[PDB]
UniProtKB/Swiss-Prot annotation, chains A, B, C, D:
Keywords: cAMP, cAMP-binding, Cell membrane, Ion channel, Ion transport, Ligand-gated ion channel, Membrane, Nucleotide-binding, Potassium, Potassium channel, Potassium transport, Transmembrane, Transmembrane helix, Transport. This is Cyclic nucleotide-gated potassium channel mll3241. It is found in: Cell membrane. GO terms for molecular function: cAMP binding; identical protein binding; intracellularly cyclic nucleotide-activated monoatomic cation channel activity; potassium channel activity; protein-containing complex binding. Its main location: membrane. Changing W227A: Loss of channel activity. The chain crosses the membrane at residues 13-30, 39-61, 75-94, 95-112, 130-150, 186-210. One of its GO terms (cellular component) is plasma membrane. It holds the Pfam family cNMP_binding. Belongs to the potassium channel family. Changing Y215A: Increased channel conductance. InterPro entries: CNG_cation_channel, cNMP-bd_CS, cNMP-bd_dom, cNMP-bd_dom_sf, Ion_trans_dom, Nucleotide_channel_N, RmlC-like_jellyroll. Residues 1-12, 62-74, 113-129, 211-355 are cytoplasmic.
Length: 355, 355, 355, 355
C-alpha cells in the first residue's frame, strides 16, 4: 500500500519469450492442420533458439565482472537452451522433436528472483512437511482401506481393489470430488463425515507451513535488501540502535523509471518518500530538482493536506517510501528530528517557488 | 467485538438500486414469457435511468465545495450510467440493448469505499503475484504436458492434444474437479499425487499474499482514520509520544444514529466509549445529557459491574469505543490518569441522579 | 498445549439430548418402515419433550438469583421447546408434525457459550463483509454474464439464460465443481483461467476476515476471563503495572474434576500450575494437600527434571497453568521473585516427605 | 531460511520399512495374479516381521538406561507389531490375514516426533473445536432439512429422505461437489448461495484453530529445545535477562553429519553459526579446526562479503545458526560485544592462513 513499483519488473526479454514460445507448440499437436502456419511457428522456435543463442555467447563472455562469481545457476539452462532442441532436431526426425519444449520452462526460473526466496525456506521447515507427509500417508491408507472392506462385494469394477479406493481417498480428501466412483451403502458413506473434516484440517496446517515463515522471509527480504540505503542518508547518524529495527520492517525500496509520475498535485497527501539516487521534477515555477539523498511529503503530513507539487520522475530514481504513522512514529520517537522537518516545512514553502 | 456500527453503512440509494435493477434483466432472457411484465421491468430500468439521471445533474452541479477536488473516479460511471443505455436504446433495436446492463455494475464500485482500499495494496505486492503467476504458469505446463505423453493413444477425443490437458490441469490443480475427463492408466493417475499437494501449497501462498498486508492496511485504516479524534479530547495533552501508537491500533470510530440504544442498563459492563460529537440520553431521573467530548463506562469497569444507565443515542453521535484491557492498559500505564477517573467514579454516582 | 481441560465441558444434558433427539426423525421419513419402532422413537421425542418440560418449570422458577438478570436469551427457546411440538401435534394431524424438529436445533445454541463470542465480532467487521459481499456480487455477474454471450447458441438447454450461468458461476468460483454443465468452446473455457484465480483470492480474504480478529477475541477471552484469579494470589502485590499484560496472554484457566490426575510422577517436567481454589493430592508419604492459592512445578523447571509427585485432583480444582519460558520470563523479569521460589525449591524437598 | 538440516531426519529403518511393507499388500488384492510374486511379497512381510522382531527383543532389553522411563508409548506397537500378524497367520487361514496390515501404520507414529507435538495442543483448544463441531452440526441439519421440503415430490429417489440430503449437505458445504444428486428447481438452488459462503467461512475459522497456536507450539518448540545450548557458550554470562527472549525465537539448532559442507567459499555471506559440539574443516592453508563452542560468519557480515573459507563438516556437529538482522540486532543491542567480534574480525584474518 506504500510503494511505487515501476520500470518493468518483468523486464528481461529472456523471460518474455518463453510464454509465446511454448504456445507455438499446440498447433503442431492437432490433426487436419494446414502446413502453412504449421512450420511458420517452428521459425519462431528457431527465432527463440537463435535469439537466446544470439544472447548465449554474450553470456558465455563471462570476462565481464570476472573476479568471484557463482553462476552455476544462471548458466544451467542457457547451455541446454540450445543444445536440447539441436540434438532433438536430428535424432527425433518425426515431429516429436517439438516435445523438447519442456526445456524453456526453466528460462523463467532462470531469471526468477523470488524463486530462490522460495527454495531458501524449504530447507528449514521440511522437517514438519515430512512428518505431515508421512501423517498424510497414515491418514491416506488408514482411511482408504476401510472402503475395500465394504463395496468389494457389490462394486468389484470400482472398489474391487485397494488403490482404486486410495484413488477415491485423495479425491475425497484433497477437496476435489471428481465424481466417477462413489459408494452406495450407508456406513461407507458415513466414513466421509470425517474425511473432509480431516483433510481440510490437514491442509489447514500443511499449506499453512508454507505461508507461515515464508512471510517471515518476505518480511525479512524487506530488511536485508534495505539495511542498504541506510548510511546514504546524511541525517541518520543520531538514530539509536534499537530505532531502526522498528522502522525498516515497513520501509520498502523500489525504482521508478524516467518520465513517470511520482506524486500528482492535489491528490490526498498520504505518504512521503526518501530520495537516495536519481533526480526528480518537483513541478514548480522554479523546479526544485532534488538529487541523491532527499525527501518530500512532510509538507503534506504535518498539515495533513494534498500535494504541494506534481513530483514526477525526471530520471530513473531508486525510491524509498513511508506512510504517516511510521513517520508520526518518528515524530513521536524524538523531538530532535522534528526541528529540521519544521524548518523544512518552512524552507520548502518559499524554496519551492523560489530557487 | 468492540464497536457499535449503525446508521446504514449501505446508505446511498445510488448503491441500493443496482441490485434490483439488474434482476430486471433475466425475465427478458427467457422464452415463452408474457409481454405484460416483459416491459414492466423495462420501466424500472427507465426509473433507475431517470433516477440516477435525476441525480446526475445534481452531481454535475459541482460548484458545491469547488476549491480543489479529484472526482475523475466518482464521475467516471455517472456519465456512462445514462449514455450507454441511451445509445443502446436506438442502435440495438432488438431486445439485445438490455445487454448493456453490464454498466450499472460499477455503480456499487462508484461509492464503494473499501474498494480503493483494495487497489491500494495491489500496487506494492504484485511483484510477488507476478513471480507466483509465472511460477503458476511454470507448474501449469510443466505438469499439463506430462499427460499428453500417456493417454493420447487411447484417449484422443479427450487427451489428444495439449490444451485439453491444460484444461484438466487447472481443474486438477485449482481445487475444482469438474469430472468430465479423467485418466484410466496408472502412472498418469500417479501424477495427481503431487498436484493437489502443489496447488493447495501454491494458493496457500498466493491467496495468502492478499490477506497478508491487506490486514496491515485495514489495521492501518484504523489509525489513519483515527489520528483524528485525538486533539478533540480535552484530557490528552499529557499523553507521551509512544503512548498513542500502543493504543490507536485498537480504537475504532463509528457513528450511531439518533434514537438508537448505546448501552442498555443491567447488561454486563464490557466496554467504555469516548463521545466526541453529538449528544446522548444517559437514562437517569435527571438525564446527564453529555455532549461533544465525553465518555462513560469506567463506572462499570473499575468495579466490573453491569451498566449504571440505559445510555441511548439522543442524536447521531460520532462514537469511539474501548474494552477494559486496553483501558486497564491505560490504568496500568499512568497513575496520573486514574485520579480523575476515580473522581469521575464518584462524581457520576451522585451526578447521575442529580444534575 | 499448556492446559488440563476436564470435567465434561459438554456437560448439561439440555445439550446432550438434541443429538439423539433429531436422529429419531429420519426413520419416520422412510417408506416400507414397520410401525413398531416408528412410534417408539416418537416416545423419545415425548421424553425429550417431557424432559425439558420437566426441566422447563424449574427454569421458569426464576426466583433464584432474582436481583438483576438478562435471560431473554436463555428463555427464548425453552418456551418454544415445548409449545411448537404441541401445536404441531394437533393441527398437523399427518406425520408432518415431526417436521417441527427444526426447533431443538437452537437448544445447543441455548447453552452454547462460544456462540455469543462469535456474534460479538460480526458487529465490528461486517463493514468489510458487505463491501466484499457486494464485491462478490460484482465479480459474480461481471463474470456470469460473459458466458451467455457464447454458448446460448449451441447450449440453449444449459446456457440459454443468465441465471443458469450464474449457477455455473459460483460453482465455478466457490471451489466446488459439481460437473453438470460445462462449456465446449475455447474462449468460454479461457475465462475460467481467472475465476478460480479470483475466488480463491476472494475467499482468501473474505473468510480471512473471520479468523482475523476472531483470534483477537479468543486471545482476548483469555484475558477478560483471567483478570480474575489475580488478586487471589497472595504474592502478586509487587507485580508492576506493565508486567501483567505480558503474562495473562498465555495464562489460561480451566477446571479439573475430583479424582482426576494432575501431573503424573516421572513424566517430563514441562509445566507448572497455580492453584487458586480446591484441593490436590500431592502423592507423597505425608501428602502435602495444598488448598486455595498454591502452585507447583518450579521443582521440575529450575532443575529441568521429571515430576517430584503424582499430583492428582483430590477435589474439583479451578486450575491455572504456565509453561517454562513465560516463567523463565518471570524468573528473568525480577530477582525479587526467584528468592522465594529458591526457598520453595528447598522447603518442598523436605516438606514433601515430611509435613 | 536460516538452518542446515542434515543427517537423515527420517533416519531409523523402523520407520523406513512401513512404506514398502504396505505396498506388498495390493498385489494380493487383485484377481488373475500369478502365484510367483504373490507369495514373494509375503516374504517381505515376514522380513519386516522378522526385522522388527529381530529389533524387538533388543528393545525388550530395557535394562539400558533403566533408571526412570515412560515407554508405554514406544512399546505399545512393537508388541502388536509381531503378535497381530501371528494370530492372524493361523486363525484367518484364507488370504484375509494380510488385512492385518493396518498394524504397521502406527510404526511411523511410533518414532514420529512431531506427532506428540500435535496431540499436545489439541488438549487446550478442543473447547473451541467442540463448540464449532456442534455449530457445524447446527448448520448441517439447519440447512440439510430445507432440501427435503422441496424436491421430495419430484425427486423421491434422490431427495425422498433426510440423510440423503444431509449427504448433499456436507458435499455442498465441505468444498467437495461430487456431482451425483443436484436440485432442479429455483429456491432449492437459491439456498446454495449461502452454503459455500458459510462452510468456507466456517472452515475458515475451524481449520484456522489448528494452525493458530500450533505455530505457537512450533515457535515454542524452537525455545524449549534451545534454552539448552545457552550455558555452553563461554561468552554469554553478560547477557541481560530480557535479552534472550528476544533472540531464541529465531535461533534454531540442527545437526550436520560428517563429510557434509557447511558454507562454501565465495557464496554470498548471508548467515553466521555458533558451534557448540563437534569439529569443522575451515578450509585454509592451515585449517583452523574449531571444536565445541565456536562461531563464524562475522567476517562476512560486518563487511557484507562472500565467504572467507569453505567450511565443511569434519565431523557430526550440533549446529546453531543466525542471520544478520538478529546479529545486527545484537551488534545494535550492546557495544560490549562488538569489541570482541571486532578483534575476531582481525584475529581470524591472520589466524586463518596461520595457526
Ligand atoms: K471441489
Ligand atoms: K465433480
Amino acid at each position: 500500500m506504500s510503494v511505487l513499483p515501476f520500470l518493468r519488473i518483468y523486464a528481461p526479454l529472456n523471460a518474455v519469450l518463453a510464454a509465446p514460445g511454448l504456445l507455438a507448440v499446440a498447433a503442431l499437436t492437432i490433426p487436419d492442420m494446414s502446413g502453412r502456419s504449421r512450420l511458420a511457428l517452428a521459425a519462431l522456435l528457431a527465432v527463440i533458439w537463435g535469439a537466446y543463442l544470439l544472447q548465449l555467447a554474450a553470456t558465455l563472455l563471462k570476462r565481464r565482472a570476472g573476479v568471484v562469481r557463482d553462476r552455476t545457476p544462471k548458466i544451467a539452462i542457457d547451455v541446454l537452451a540450445v543444445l536440447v532442441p539441436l540434438a532433438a532436431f536430428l535424432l527425433d526426425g518425426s515431429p516429436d522433436w517439438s516435445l523438447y519444449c519442456a526445456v524453456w520452462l526453466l528460462k523463467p526460473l532462470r531469471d526468477s528472483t523470488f524463486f530462490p526466496v522460495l527454495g531458501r525456506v524449504l530447507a528449514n521447515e521440511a522437517r514438519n512437511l515430512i512428518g505431515v507427509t508421512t501423517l498424510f500417508g497414515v491418514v491416506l491408507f488408514a482411511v482408504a482401506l476401510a472402503a475395500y472392506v465394504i463395496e468389494r462385494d457389490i462394486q468389484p469394477e470400482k472398489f474391487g481393489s485397494i488403490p482404486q479406493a486410495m484413488w477415491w481417498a485423495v479425491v475425497t480428501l484433497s477437496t476435489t470430488g471428481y465424481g466417477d466412483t462413489i459408494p452406495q451403502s450407508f456406513a461407507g458413506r458415513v466414513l466421509a463425515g470425517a474425511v473432509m473434516m480431516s483433510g481440510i484440517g490437514i491442509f489447514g496446517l500443511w499449506a499453512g507451513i508454507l505461508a507461515t515463515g515464508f512471510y517471515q522471509e518476505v518480511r525479512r527480504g524487506d530488511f536485508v535488501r534495505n539495511w542498504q540505503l541506510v548510511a546514504a542518508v546524511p541525517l541518520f547518524q543520531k538514530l539509536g540502535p534499537a530505532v531502526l529495527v522498528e522502522i525498516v520492517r515497513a520501509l520498502r525500496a523500489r525504482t521508478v523509471p524516467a518520465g513517470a509520475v511520482i506524486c500528482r498535485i492535489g491528490e490526498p497527501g498520504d505518504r512521503m518518500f526518501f530520495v537516495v539516487e536519481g533526480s526528480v521534477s518537483v513541478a514548480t515555477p522554479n523546479p526544485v530538482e532534488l538529487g541523491p539523498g532527499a525527501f518530500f511529503g512532510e509538507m503534506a503530513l504535518i498539515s495533513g493536506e494534498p500535494r504541494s507539487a506534481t513530483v514526477s520522475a525526471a530520471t530513473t530514481v531508486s525510491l524509498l517510501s513511508l506512510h504517516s504513522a511510521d513517520f508520526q512514529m518518528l515524530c513521536s520517537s524524538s523531538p530532535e528530528i522534528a526541528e529540521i522537518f519544521r524548518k523544512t516545512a518552512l524552507e520548502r514553502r518559499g524554496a519551492a517557488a523560489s530557487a
